Amino acid sequence: XTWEXWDXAIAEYAXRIEXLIXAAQEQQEKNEXALXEL
Amino acid sequence: XTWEXWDXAIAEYAXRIEXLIXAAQEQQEKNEXALXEL
Amino acid sequence: XWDXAIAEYAXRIEXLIXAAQEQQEKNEXALXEL
Numbered sequence A, B: 001x002t003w004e005x006w007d008x009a010i011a012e013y014a015x016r017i018e019x020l021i022x023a024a025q026e027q028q029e030k031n032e033x034a035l036x037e038l
Numbered sequence C: 001x002w003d004x005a006i007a008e009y010a011x012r013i014e015x016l017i018x019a020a021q022e023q024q025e026k027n028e029x030a031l032x033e034l
Helices: A004-038 B002-036 C002-033
Strands: none
Touching: A004 B002, A004 C002, B002 C002
16 A cells, blocks of 8 residues: 555656657657648 | 655655656747747 | 655656657757758
């Protein structure tokens, strides 16, 4: 169980950040849409 | 008081991660600025 | 020992925030071209 709880939480923030880097790659692939339309 | 302290310290790093993920989203929402200034 | 623990979390998390900024510098490719 609480310490091994936290080391859970941090790995499941690291979910959220690999989330952000989803979002950024799926901007990159809109940007490369834009550069299509140009 | 000590471990309910430690469990304080970790939750207030998890403050900073949620600071960082502010910063990443408010860069993402600058990127969508760049993609505006087309 | 424990401030060990947090600094070696910030290893992992701020490791990943490396990966996000070095995706951001991929995003700045098109936003370079346009």
